[PDB]
Design a protein around this ligand. Structure first.
Ligand SMILES: CC1=C(CCOP(=O)(O)OP(=O)(O)O)S/C(=C(/O)CCC(=O)O)N1Cc1cnc(C)nc1N
Ligand SMILES: CC1=C(CCOP(=O)(O)OP(=O)(O)O)S/C(=C(/O)CCC(=O)O)N1Cc1cnc(C)nc1N
Ligand SMILES: [Ca+2]
Ligand SMILES: [Ca+2]
Ligand SMILES: [Mg+2]
Ligand SMILES: [Mg+2]
Lengths: 844, 837
């Protein structure tokens, strides 16, 4: 009504465009959804933040920035400087691309569409999950990578699903067309045939991107992945984080460049529905997981196979999950490749300025069916009636560039004729060039002293008392530090100290050690104390970090990276798997709170850890620490599901162990870090046995011994025990050994021997046969276990042991809990009665 | 100019005031008299600012300007930016009684069971009066039930002080003396049911608490499923006549678990979906600013633990746990918002954890600053009590007497319990015999029923335009119903349609389940010209005379989730035991995304909690050369999980046997999950078809012989080699036998993998007296499929029949299959050549 009233209505209007203008922006190239102050005041001047501008001018700047082909979501960001940064770059006149840059974009759209159309012609009946209707993804990714090269970064690491995967591999990464054509030909040379393999749209590649108009180059990698959509997200993060740590960039680096950029592509239905997306975004700013911001690209073809977005998500945008970490979101029209390239460059600039994630929602469509053989009009007839009227983005942009006067019709035709002639000469060459069953990858990696000097044990012990000046140790943490120095010099080394002796000795030898998991710094069972907290100030101290410096003051090259993970299994296990792939020379350990929670990461275990080598030739040396054992804490605090990992095992893909002594655990970890084999290690670790006074080791077991896959009772190897008196053999693994040994001693049963299987997979066949041959008077052999009959090692051992060793194990019987639906009973009293029945049966 | 600066200030408070609000009980981190323009009324700046400070910068942080619906922003704004009437002395006293019960229950167990883990709510006592206000507000709206799901934090306190679980039952559990059945679970995993009666109102409401494992947040989709089934039974909500959503999910969370677990996002993503919505969940985050020894800085990459809830535009209220009046008020506002917009609401209760993570843990080892502050802090109960003695509401004597009365009541129940005669502790027993199958059960239907389901596919609405490639499916189904040669996809719909016709509620969902991943189902058909939907099976919900059967066909395309979708269907089946609930995986290879649900609820829920579920998992399975993720439903994993007859596991080879399996499952009266390994290419195998007689005069066959012996000129006595198999490999083996005229070889199919059909298998094998060798033949690698369990169990349960049983399979493999279809083809031929070698 007044001057103060009008100037106030304008400020609300400005805010309305900045907050909700994205809901009006012309972002959908299909235009499916139909429902998507006075006139004298437009020429009046108003106060804007400090200059005076006309309302018409304020309105035109706002409609240009927020209501054209780019929908900007940023007012949810809590940091005001990030809101100002976006506002300043979005609310200004944008410099038009040069004719050369426009021609370059069209060349990318040409190769994108001509690649898809060549495959439709040659291999009409072969699934390729085409990028048709989304070809702008190619110039957009090219702009992301080019912008990264402009900032002088070292590498872009890509992870993506099926949508236009082959197109990306050929036109962004640089994977030869001959290789991609040999895969459709179904004829692979012995190197491409090796292992069991995977489908062509799961494969990765590496290359060097060279700037078209710049002088920089950048490494471009694409990681392998399963069909399981979004499963590769935390794997990419881990991979990038390991590479950043090697380059001394990022979080654990001297420079704050985060010079390895994660570029993560997603489908619209997969991005909204999969939980691992939220779990992975939740890591984006964590000290132990951040990679300085990921560039996310959502290929939003407004469809997920036959499912409409209305049935796929409960939110406006498929990208709304990214608001949880305050990521800016750019919804961009896939038919405007210049707006797509510009947004991609802005996204990289934002990542570089704030070391935070950025989401690009590319609104497009899927020209053909879900796969190339599918008819989408059965379920989406309206959408496909609209798509059938739509001229592709390539034709649209070509007609735009001719009208502008940039290129001629002849120049456009010739450019496509050249590219079509090139694909045909490559296809002919491969076509011009016997299928056998897949072979096991076991022999692919074959290959050891793990003992350390007394001085090394003493150094790791002393490190626990080499406290900074003034440091106030918690009075209940102080005895751990003092008892460890004593253990290092006097023996009776417990499990938790043996672990740190192995990690510390590896650090001292120059190895990078990464250890993480839930409450892993202290230890779930208050046993580790890898990090100690000053009682008065809260300052942290990591005793093992002192081992990264030689006594002369020089660095060993080693480092101790220990973290408390977020409350995740899927993303945390994915990340550590990725980290180990990213740095094969690192010692990477992930610890479950209890092994019962690793089933939250079942997709990682099944799709990456146990099978990644056979499927993609991708090697990982990740260690999974799974606290395991029947102690009466209930069905979710008892089992690490040994039977599942043993079932998954084949082709020597993993090592699976359940060590019974601290020294054997020490040697197992050192063998794993020093063997030069990149294969995952699954370890079933103790809980109560951490504080079992019988479960301790002598210094000579660390300094003069090695890993023992099979263990005999000390009375026959280092004592006065007679192996010829033994009539009954009890074969076992884990903590049940001490309970059986205590019963044998109590009853003086010289007729019974207890043999421990420390390495569950691969089965130590020769070692087991050699050990059993030392007991010639054995009349009966029993596999004894705590676990229910359908769980533990019995389901695999009961079947494999009589087969691999018939002369030793024909007639092998089982002593265990009954078969159970849950891993144990809920009552500790019921556990106690069942545990005593096992001991009574074994000695009956 | 000034009026414009005032509007920016109003917006600043509404948008960012929550970042200044005094929400943390630990505290760890001139123009004012002028009138301004703000219906359109003129208000002084002092009053504008007072309203803004009271609403957004005191003990309540309000996050709502992210909500895209303007009407929802106006609704919150109007209720938050007004003077709030102070609670009556009676209401304040009622809140104190709740704080009294909460802290005295925790202090009583500390005194009596010093050495037992109870995950105390000390420092978060306000959770109890807050939950009481949520439930009371639901009763005020005249709703029917509140269904609760929560983790460990103050679980026993909630059971005793909100749900109504007897103290005697809770004490008897700490005493380790139980009057228990199945293998059971820990006390803070248990559920209860009861009736809440309003203190100052005339209404009552049912209050239920669901069971759950240690796996944090895994119960979230299960609660939604449970609520959805109850809402469908009451004809309320999405599939109901009235839009009341009269059953309320009340979901409690811990701050670290809410930020870190993916299933939270997956479950919020369901909140407005047609097939999953429950009309809005009330979320309560017990934000004690700690997760065991982990600081929030290591737990999340966002300001608030609740930021994940902004993806569905849920309003978020950050409330100071030391202000129980503000907590009760926010809880009531939450219920009012849920009722008005049928959307989720998140209450972030900022509190602390008085003791260690568990009662035996020392938290100062890792959080000495936090525990130095907590040891200076007077509890919420003492604070509130002192504020009341200060306001003049109550005397010191009245406060003491109330605590003495409650403490005396606890001591009397504890002693009565202690006085009970102890029982001898025995090992847990198998729950197998708890649910007995009716020996003989009729699943056959009349030919008229098949014909009705066939005719329903052509009973199209007037003017409906069928897609030309969908039309032959509809016509071929009417022909199959009258003439036979019924394929797998039609037998599925014959089973579901016959159940609907008999009055059963059928819920079928999964990824692209309406059409079918393999374009086979067409449960829903789409008008080619308009896009209008038509569900032929829905016509079976009406009898020929026009009356309802009571049955219903609920078929949906799920979101792209496994964990939340499997969790939801598990919950749905628990919520309505009389419903037929089927969840379909796109390929069985993706069910490992829901491994926590399979391991913690489906396979073990009966033995742990006595919780029964009849959920059906449909897992497309088979070696066809599509790669390691499009081949196996991990049969070996489900067989390994099986014990105590907890589940039925089948791999049917004929459409009729699948039909009878589904009907037996829906009509047996047993509430046990069914795992079905279903076909892909075999859906279109012309040999894999059934006669009408198999649906009308037969029953489910756990073991199947070759038709040449049961219905042909085959001679069983000529058989010297027996091949034992399951699934689609049967047709390839049968085709090879026919090609080579091998009368010396017989192929026996095991249709029901678990429980093993011991008697039928023994009776079948006895019909082949000249057998000299038996082989288990399978497509799956040696360490996979049925061999790992059958190779061990078959020679044990049937030694006279299976001693010397050998295996024919793919080699043991790390991946479920090779990546090349050419390599699959060569391996498949080697199996067939070995079996007939
Ligand atoms: C549901 C599903 C698909 C629909 C994906 O929808 P979007 O995310 O919008 O992607 P597009 O529209 O296809 O670009 S593709 C798909 C495939 O099999 C990928 C092709 C492959 O690599 O094999 N699956 C099946 C599927 C279901 N659940 C999970 C966790 N992962 C899956 N891959
Ligand atoms: C990590 C973890 C806990 C810390 C939880 O932190 P918050 O969410 O902030 O909860 P509180 O502070 O304890 O209220 S409790 C817990 C327990 O086992 C509770 C006792 C029980 O229920 O048996 N686990 C272990 C855990 C790890 N991962 C998964 C998926 N679930 C878990 N339960
Ligand atoms: Ca290694
Ligand atoms: Ca049933
Ligand atoms: Mg899509
Ligand atoms: Mg907490």
């Amino acid at each position: 009504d007044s001057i103060e009233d009008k100037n106030a209505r304008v400020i609300e209007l400005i805010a309305a465009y900045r907050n909700r203008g994205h809901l009006m922006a012309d972002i959908d190239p299909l235009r499916l959804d139909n429902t998507r102050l006075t006139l004298w005041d437009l020429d009046r001047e108003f106060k804007v933040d400090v200059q005076r501008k006309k309302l018409r001018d304020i309105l035109s700047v706002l409609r240009d920035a927020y209501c054209r082909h780019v929908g900007v979501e940023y007012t949810h960001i809590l940091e005001p400087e990030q809101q100002r940064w976006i506002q300043e770059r979005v609310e200004t006149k944008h410099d038009k691309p040069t004719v050369a840059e426009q021609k370059y974009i069209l060349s990318k759209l040409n190769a994108a569409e001509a690649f898809e159309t060549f495959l439709q012609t040659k291999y009409v009946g072969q699934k390729r999950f085409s990028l048709e209707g989304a070809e702008t993804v190619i110039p957009m990714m090219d702009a992301v990578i080019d912008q990264c090269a402009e900032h002088g970064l070292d590498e872009v690491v890509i992870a993506m699903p099926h949508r236009g995967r082959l197109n990306v591999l050929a036109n962004i990464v640089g994977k030869p067309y001959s290789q991609i054509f040999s895969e459709f030909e179904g004829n692979l040379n012995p190197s491409q045939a090796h292992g069991s393999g995977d489908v062509k749209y799961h494969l990765g590649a590496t290359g060097t991107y060279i700037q078209m108009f710049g002088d920089n180059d950048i490494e471009v990698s694409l990681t392998a992945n399963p069909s399981h959509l979004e499963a590769v997200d935390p794997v990419l993060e881990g991979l990038v984080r390991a590479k950043q740590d090697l380059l001394d960039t990022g979080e654990e680096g001297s420079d704050n460049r985060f010079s390895v950029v994660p570029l993560m592509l997603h489908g619209d239905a997969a991005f909204a529905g999969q939980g691992v997306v939220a779990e992975t975004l939740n890591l984006a700013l964590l000290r132990g997981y951040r990679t300085g911001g990921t560039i996310h690209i959502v290929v939003n073809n407004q469809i997920g196979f036959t499912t409409a977005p209305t049935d796929s998500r409960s939110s406006e945008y498929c990208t709304d999950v990214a608001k949880m970490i305050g990521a800016p979101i750019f919804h961009v029209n896939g038919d405007d490749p210049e707006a797509c390239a510009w947004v991609a460059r802005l996204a990289v600039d934002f990542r570089q300025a704030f070391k935070k994630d950025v989401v690009i929602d590319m609104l497009c469509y899927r020209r053909r069916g879900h796969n190339e053989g599918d008819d989408p009009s059965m379920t989406q007839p309206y959408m496909y009636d609209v798509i059938d009227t739509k001229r592709g983005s390539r034709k649209a942009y070509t007609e735009a560039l001719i009208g502008r006067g940039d290129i001629s019709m002849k120049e456009a035709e010739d450019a496509l004729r050249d590219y079509q002639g090139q694909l045909e000469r490559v296809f002919n060459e491969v076509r011009e060039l016997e299928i056998e069953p897949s072979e096991s990858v076991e022999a692919d990696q074959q290959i050891l002293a793990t003992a350390v000097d007394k001085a090394m044990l003493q150094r790791i012990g002393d490190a626990h008392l080499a406290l900074p000046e003034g440091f106030t140790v918690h009075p209940r943490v102080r005895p751990v530090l003092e008892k460890r120095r004593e253990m290092a010099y006097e023996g009776r080394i417990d499990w938790a100290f043996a672990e740190l002796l192995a990690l510390g000795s590896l650090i001292a030898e120059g190895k990078l050690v990464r250890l993480s998991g839930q409450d892993t710094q202290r230890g779930t069972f208050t046993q580790r104390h890898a990090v100690i907290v000053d009682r008065k100030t809260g300052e942290e101290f990591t005793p093992l970090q002192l081992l990264a410096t030689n006594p002369d003051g020089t660095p060993t090259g080693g480092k101790f990276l220990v973290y408390n993970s977020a409350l995740s299994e899927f993303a945390a296990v994915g990340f550590e798997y990725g980290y180990s792939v990213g740095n094969p020379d690192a010692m990477v350990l992930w610890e479950a709170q209890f092994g019962d929670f690793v089933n939250g990461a079942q997709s990682i275990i099944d799709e990456f850890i146990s099978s990644g080598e056979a499927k993609w030739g991708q090697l990982s040396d990740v260690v999974l620490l799974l606290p395991h054992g029947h102690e009466g804490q209930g069905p979710d605090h008892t089992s690490g599901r040994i039977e599942r990992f043993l079932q998954l095992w084949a082709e020597g893909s993993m090592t699976i162990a359940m060590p019974s002594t601290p020294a054997n655990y020490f040697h197992l970890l050192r063998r794993h870090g020093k063997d030069g084999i990149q294969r995952p290690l699954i370890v079933f670790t103790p809980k109560s046995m951490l504080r079992n006074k019988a479960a301790v080791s002598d210094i000579r077991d660390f300094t003069e011994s090695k890993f023992r896959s099979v263990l005999e009772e000390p009375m026959y190897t280092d004592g006065e025990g007679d192996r010829n008196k033994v009539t009954r053999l009890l074969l076992t693994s884990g903590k049940i050994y001490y309970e059986l040994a205590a019963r044998k001693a109590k009853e003086n049963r010289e007729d019974v021997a207890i043999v421990r299987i420390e390495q569950l997979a691969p089965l130590p066949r020769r070692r087991l046969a050699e050990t059993l041959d030392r007991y010639p008077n054995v009349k009966e052999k029993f596999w004894v276990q705590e676990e229910p009959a359908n769980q533990g090692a019995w389901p695999s051992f009961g079947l494999t042991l009589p087969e691999i060793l018939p002369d030793h194990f024909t007639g092998l019987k089982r002593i265990s809990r009954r078969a159970m639906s849950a891993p144990s009973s809920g009552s500790s009293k019921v556990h106690a009665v069942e545990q005593q029945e096992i001991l009574d049966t074994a000695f009956g």
